[PDB]
Design a protein around this ligand. Structure first.
Ligand SMILES: Nc1ncnc2c1ncn2[C@@H]1O[C@H](COP(=O)(O)OP(=O)(O)OP(=O)(O)O)[C@@H](O)[C@H]1O
Ligand SMILES: Nc1ncnc2c1ncn2[C@@H]1O[C@H](COP(=O)(O)OP(=O)(O)OP(=O)(O)O)[C@@H](O)[C@H]1O
Ligand SMILES: [Mg+2]
Ligand SMILES: [Mg+2]
Length: 1217
């Protein structure tokens, strides 16, 4: 959408922020112009240390002077890298933490009708969680990196064009020659990676179907050919992944092969310009290296323009609510204030519709009257808009035509602090703000005294239940410290709505907890608060309204009938149908936020996003998404187990380890040939310098072709090894998911959107954990090792001093690589406790706006943004000082080497080019050792969260489909028998749907398990085949227990017909031959014409070939049912299972079932459940299930012969349509 400029993000800056962005913008320019000044001091040293080869007294006075200028260069990098980190991290905190205080003043003052849960308070909650962390990413510390490397470019050219300006043009013209082939590489690597993501989605839905339809893959045993259709469509991503390793070996060989053919260009013309008497060996070392590392420092300034475009998109969404004008506002002077109220509410000619869609008309000419000191009741039987009345006295909306008089005074002339001070609200599942249970009661009144809080808790049946809690009125209700965790809460709103002492009380449908004798406790507590108050009762069910003096009824836009409950039961006017209807009878925001966090979590950093959940019933819980540190949960032997799985490719690891050592010979050979030409440039024999610099250019060219052939071996191999592992792992993951029990799939984090991406993202990052972390170890440890053997043959007295310094030269190059990604780690973890206070002052704003609790959600937020500011003051002063102090041991220790080397030459021990060769080789080596120790924790710290997918391999199923020590099944005649069995669901173990259940189904009979409004009726077929095991008891089948048999050899002769039949994405020739392996045309045509649909199946364009499940032709609910019966007649089972429930007919003119329900049962033992009391006249036997028991058994001549029982009550519901 629209976007702000890059400025106006700095509009929350006070006068102390214009001082930290000025001291912190001299620290970014002085630290920038220090690497092109290091090349000016190290260049002028070599002129003093190497022109004086004949006078060893002029040497020592000109190396002792320039090695004092490195200690002076250290103190200017120490005190100016301190000033760009300690001043841009703390000034980027104080600006975003005053954006949070004005965005929350803005989102507490908009109208309450703005938040109607229609993905509106799932965007406000997301904009306070993540859009505020994108402004802080953009303006804090990636602005210091923008000024640092831009001024390294501008200072790298001025040092370059002053020393030697001809060599500063040959070294800049080379830079397009390197960035072209280093940028054309990155184009042709995304062109393979994007085709890999495209060629995977053919196999991305075959894994997806077998998880979301797992009950059908088990009943028809085809869990061994959901692998063979998944092991074929991965073989086109393996082969396309072989040529994304060759396009990297040719992309790094031909990028290191042009740079090596460009040091042969700049060091040949330097050898011509010295012989002409124009330069020397220190003005040319300066000019070449200052213009190369200066021009390369524009790839790091422009790397920050990606975060600068996220911080302008996110920052506009926040800045369009901060200055948004609401409608229903407070006027402190243009608003009256009455006294001695009485509570006479009257809607005089009010019409109103919700502003989400003005098409409907809820309140067409609405007219009521609420007396003083009395009780009323507003009741309906459908969506009549009776909860809208209590959502309109609060002024959450406006009546767009009409007026509302309070004691004859219009409420639009009263401000919104006198109206809401006299009205108290109680609503559904009341707001429990995550504080103690003294602070929640003190929202109705802030502080009067202590004894009134106990007095309000006394007359609510609330005093005893907070004294059987071993803490003194101080209990965490948000987190489960001490659990008042009953479904019957104490409705502590009633404790709030008594301490406030309102004159008008707006109750609501407060029977929403499956009411019983437990919920009758607060029923009389409501009868002890509705005294002397003009209260209303919005009643959902009429069973609790039966003692109310006056009741009004609305049906369509207006009131219909009023009066007491004697003429209400009389005359049958629009109330007798409602009492007939009484006889015949959040966790969603977390799914909205995580899918909004989906497709925005592969590009965004893991320390900048969240992951959402439900938590307890106190708040929405936010995990900082850098939980990989606190998890630390992989097996201790995970690195050997991923090598045992990756062994058949042992030739493709030996032939890549003689390609990773040969790449470690290119680095330490560049630093020998380049440090042999510093020596040669100080010759005075201008013909023996020409013929010895032709032989140092030919090495640069000949080893610029060695680099092409030694990165093609390292990266074509180790990609054959690493793409036969992510193919082998994904097959071992799907073959282990489709072996677990059914109840494992029923949980909330095992749905088919977080479990089919673990095979797509968490299974393809095992390549960069055991193949791309060996290639950069064999390479970097044969470069460290070949440069401590050469450098102890040349000279061992200087290189033993560098060996004692070497922990300090690798610690300074380790801090220079953490600074490319910033020193303000995991910034989403400190801003998690502060965000949940805004994350529940928005989703509970219907109770925040009531009680006038708006100035307390803001003072629990300004008083609690002080914790991440003292965490970001101590972290910026420390990390900014330890960075600059470790840059002082990098320049103050290269001045100890070059001084001790100059002392050996003047005593006649060493020579020139024995100190420079030892210096250049052992310093460039130190820049590679601090890359190996940067990936050193992740090898120990369990890989990471994506390399920790062993929980699908190392997991023990409860129901094992295949056993060797199990009896094989040859014939089941059908002997279904249930012994004393009770059962519950593992997803919710409190409900006890079965209680000593018993059946006995003889062979050659049927069964007609009755509806009974869902008394556990579609759970008997879920134990005939083991979708769930019982808690206690035995399931008897063929005179044997069911937990003794080969499960795969039992499910191929028990075939069900699903509740809502689903079809795979294929033709109607596989979906009618998935129930029998090997049938082609012989019994397939006959399997059509048994539940026939033959004109439906011959009337079709390509014969029996059309996609019907996904991305194909659409069928109806009556025709999909016809296909699933064709499976069950092709398979020809012995035990048949049917399942129909909860209005699943979905088609008038019922003929899709009447043909199949009588032909199919002629030789089988069938079990039939149907929710309607029609077409269920199975004349063998019929039983009734109630609360986990059978109550009556016998055919349909001993079932209606009893006068009532329980069956004839259901016979009354036949005429109740
Ligand atoms: N944000 C909204 N947009 C459109 N329609 C709404 C919105 N909120 C509520 N409604 C409608 O208002 C009606 C309110 O019905 P009613 O007053 O009888 O309350 P209820 O359905 O008994 O109880 P509850 O309000 O708890 O569902 C609903 O049928 C619903 O369709
Ligand atoms: N996997 C499950 N998860 C949660 N609750 C279940 C599960 N299976 C059964 N139940 C509970 O047990 C009862 C099952 O009754 P049954 O499924 O036989 O018919 P039904 O519930 O009327 O049909 P439907 O399940 O299609 O609504 C339901 O009320 C449900 O609350
Ligand atoms: Mg509703
Ligand atoms: Mg159900």
């Amino acid at each position: 959408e629209q976007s702000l400029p890059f400025f106006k993000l700095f509009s929350f800056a006070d006068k102390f922020d214009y001082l930290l962005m000025f001291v912190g913008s001299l620290g970014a320019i002085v630290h920038g112009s220090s690497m092109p000044v290091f090349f000016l001091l190290f260049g002028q040293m070599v002129n003093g240390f190497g022109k004086n080869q004949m006078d060893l007294h002029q040497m020592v006075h000109e190396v002792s002077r320039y090695s004092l200028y490195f200690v002076y260069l250290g103190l200017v990098v120490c005190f100016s890298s301190y000033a760009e980190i300690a001043c841009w991290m703390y000034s980027g905190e104080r600006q975003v933490a005053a954006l949070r205080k004005k965005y929350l003043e803005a989102v507490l003052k908009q109208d309450v009708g703005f938040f109607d849960t229609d993905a509106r308070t799932g965007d406000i909650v997301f904009s306070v969680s993540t859009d505020t962390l994108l402004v802080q990413d953009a303006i804090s510390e990636k602005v210091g990196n923008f000024i640092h490397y831009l001024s390294t470019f501008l200072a790298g050219l001025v040092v370059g064009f002053v020393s030697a300006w001809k060599l500063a043009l040959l070294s800049v013209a080379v830079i397009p020659g390197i960035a072209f082939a280093g940028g054309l590489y990155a184009y042709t690597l995304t062109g393979i990676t994007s085709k890999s993501r495209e060629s995977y989605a053919n196999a991305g839905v075959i894994a997806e179907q077998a998880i979301a339809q797992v009950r059908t893959v088990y009943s028809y045993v085809g869990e061994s050919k959901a692998l063979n259709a998944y092991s074929d469509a991965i073989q086109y991503t393996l082969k396309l992944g072989y040529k994304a390793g060759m396009a990297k070996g040719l992309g790094l060989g031909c990028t290191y092969g042009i740079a090596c053919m460009s040091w042969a260009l700049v060091f040949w013309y330097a050898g011509v310009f010295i012989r002409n008497g124009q330069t020397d060996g220190g003005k040319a070392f300066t000019a070449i290296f200052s213009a190369i590392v200066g021009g390369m420092s524009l790839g790091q300034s422009f790397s920050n323009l990606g975060a600068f475009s996220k911080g302008k998109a996110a920052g506009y969404k926040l800045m369009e609510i901060i200055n948004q004008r609401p409608t229903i506002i407070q006027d402190p002077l243009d608003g009256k204030c009455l006294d001695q109220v009485h509570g006479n509410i009257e809607f005089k000619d009010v019409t109103f519709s919700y502003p989400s869609r003005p098409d409907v008309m809820i309140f067409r000419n609405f007219n009521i009257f609420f007396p003083s000191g009395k009780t009323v009741a507003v009741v309906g039987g459908s969506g009549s808009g009776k909860s809208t009345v209590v959502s309109l006295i609060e002024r959450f909306y406006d009546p767009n035509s009409g007026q509302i008089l309070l004691d004859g005074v219009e409420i639009k002339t009263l401000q919104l602090k006198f109206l809401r001070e006299q009205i108290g609200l109680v609503n559904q599942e009341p707001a429990l703000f995550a504080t103690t249970i003294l602070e929640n009661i003190l929202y109705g009144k802030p502080d009067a005294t202590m004894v009134e809080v106990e007095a309000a808790a006394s007359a609510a049946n609330a005093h005893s239940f907070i004294t059987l809690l071993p803490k003194g009125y101080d209990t965490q209700v948000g987190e489960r410290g001490v659990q008042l965790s009953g479904g019957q809460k104490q409705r502590i709103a009633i404790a709030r709505a008594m301490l406030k002492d309102p004159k008008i009380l707006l109750l609501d449908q407060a029977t929403s907890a499956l009411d019983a004798s437990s919920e009758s406790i607060v029923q009389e507590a409501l009868d002890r608060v509705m005294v002397g108050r003009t209260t209303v009762v919005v009643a959902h069910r009429l069973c609790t309204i039966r003692n109310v003096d006056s009741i009004a009824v609305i049906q369509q836009g207006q009131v219909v009938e009023t009066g007491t409950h004697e003429e209400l039961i009389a005359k049958s006017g629009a109330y007798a149908s409602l009492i007939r209807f009484q006889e015949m009878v959040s966790t969603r925001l977390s799914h909205s936020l995580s899918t909004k966090s989906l497709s925005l979590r592969s590009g965004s950093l893991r320390n900048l996003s969240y992951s959402y959940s439900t938590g307890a019933d106190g708040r929405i819980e936010m995990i900082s998404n850098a939980e990989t540190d606190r998890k630390t949960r992989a097996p201790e032997n995970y690195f050997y187990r991923l090598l045992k799985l990756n062994s058949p490719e042992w030739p493709y690891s030996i032939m890549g380890a003689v390609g990773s050592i040969l790449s470690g010979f290119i680095g330490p050979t560049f630093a020998i040939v380049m440090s042999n030409m510093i020596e040669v440039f100080y010759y005075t024999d201008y013909d023996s310098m020409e013929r010895k610099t032709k032989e140092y250019v030919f090495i640069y060219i000949g080893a610029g072709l060695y680099a092409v052939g030694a990165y093609l071996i390292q990266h074509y191999f180790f990609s054959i090894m690493g793409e036969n592992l992510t193919t082998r792992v994904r097959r071992m993951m799907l073959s282990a998911i489709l072996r677990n029990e059914v109840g494992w799939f029923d949980e909330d984090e095992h749905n088919s959107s977080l479990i089919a991406a673990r095979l797509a993202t968490d299974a393809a990052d095992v390549k960069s954990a055991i193949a791309e972390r060996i290639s950069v170890i064999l390479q970097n440890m044969t470069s460290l090792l070949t440069s401590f053997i050469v450098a102890f043959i040349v000279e061992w007295r200087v290189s033993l001093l560098i060996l004692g310094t070497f922990p300090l030269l690798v610690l300074a190059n380790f801090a220079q690589q953490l600074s490319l990604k910033g020193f303000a780690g995991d910034t989403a973890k400190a801003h998690a406790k502060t965000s949940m206070i805004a994350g529940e002052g928005v989703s509970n704003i219907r109770t925040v706006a009531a009680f006038n609790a708006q100035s307390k959600i803001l003072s629990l937020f300004c008083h609690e943004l002080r914790v991440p500011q003292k965490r970001s003051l101590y972290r910026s002063q420390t990390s900014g000082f330890l960075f600059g102090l470790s840059q002082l041991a990098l320049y103050g220790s290269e001045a100890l080497i070059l001084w001790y080397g100059a002392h050996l030459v003047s005593k006649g021990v060493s020579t020139f080019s024995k100190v420079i060769k030892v210096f250049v080789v052992l310093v460039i080596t130190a820049n590679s050792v601090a890359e190996t120790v940067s990936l050193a924790p992740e090898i120990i710290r369990g890989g990471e969260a994506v390399g920790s997918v062993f929980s699908v391999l190392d997991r023990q199923t409860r129901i094992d489909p295949d056993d060797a020590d199990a009896d094989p099944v040859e014939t089941i005649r059908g002997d279904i028998e249930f012994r004393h069995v009770d059962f519950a669901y593992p997803s919710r173990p409190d409900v006890m749907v079965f209680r000593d259940f018993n059946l006995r189904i003889r062979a050659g009979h049927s069964q007609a398990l009755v509806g009974a409004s869902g008394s556990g009726k579609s759970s008997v077929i879920a134990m005939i085949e083991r979708f769930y095991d019982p808690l206690a008891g035995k399931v008897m089948i063929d005179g044997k227990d069911i937990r003794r048999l080969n499960l795969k050899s039992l499910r191929l002769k028990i075939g069900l017909v699903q509740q809502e039949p689903a079809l795979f994405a294929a033709t109607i020739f596989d979906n009618i031959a998935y129930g029998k392996d090997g049938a082609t045309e012989s019994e397939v045509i006959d399997a059509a014409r048994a539940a026939n649909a033959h004109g439906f199946i011959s009337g079709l364009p390509e014969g029996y070939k059309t996609p019907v499940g996904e991305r194909g032709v659409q069928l109806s609910g009556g025709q999909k049912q016809r296909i699933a019966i064709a499976r069950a007649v092709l398979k020809n089972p012995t035990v048949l299972l049917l399942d129909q429930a909860t209005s699943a007919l979905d088609a008038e003119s019922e003929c899709v079932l009447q043909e199949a329900l009588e032909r199919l049962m002629r030789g089988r033992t069938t079990v039939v459940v149907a929710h309607r009391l029609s077409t269920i006249r199975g004349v063998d036997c019929i039983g009734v299930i109630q609360d986990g028991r059978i109550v009556e058994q016998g055919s349909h001549s001993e079932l209606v012969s009893r006068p009532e029982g329980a069956y004839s009550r259901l016979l009354q519901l036949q005429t109740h349509r």
